[PDB]
Structures are given as C-alpha cells and as structure tokens.
C-alpha cells in the first residue's frame, strides 16, 4: 500500500515514497465566518464568529 482514500475518495493518509513512515492528511482551517452586527442606524460595532 502507498496511500488510502476516505469516504470522500480523497487522499487522507499517504506514506513517504521511500521511507516507511506514514503521515495522515487533515485539512487546516477552511471554515466559514459570519458577522453579527445591529442596524446601521443604531451603531456600527460588529462581531466576528467562526
């Protein structure tokens, strides 16, 4: 075996081409961001939520 595929059919665990050591693949921060703010007539303060 060289590399495996998850349920999404993507490379999630690949070994080195020569070394027997195996490294898992986990994506880093890629999620969405939302902004919570009141109406513009009241104020302009905003909140950052992930």
């Amino acid at each position: 075996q060289q590399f495996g595929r998850d349920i999404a059919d993507t490379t999630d665990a690949v070994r080195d081409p020569q070394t027997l050591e195996i490294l898992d693949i986990t994506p880093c921060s890629f999620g969405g961001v939302s902004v919570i703010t009141p109406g513009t007539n009241t104020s302009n303060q905003v909140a950052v939520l992930y």
């Binding site: 999404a8 993507t10 994506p27 999620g31 969405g32």
Partner: peptide
C-alpha cells in the same frame, strides 16, 4: 431528563458542515 426522554435519546443513533441548532 426523564427516563422516557433518556430512552428516546438512546434509541436514536470540505465545504459542507452541520450548524448546531439554536
């Protein structure tokens, strides 16, 4: 939670994500 609600809870088992309910 009542034991009935416990029984009902125990009897139920890449871009897309699941937002938790309010």
């Amino acid at each position: 939670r009542s034991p009935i609600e416990d029984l009902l809870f125990n009897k139920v088992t890449k871009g897309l994500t699941v937002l938790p309910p309010l």
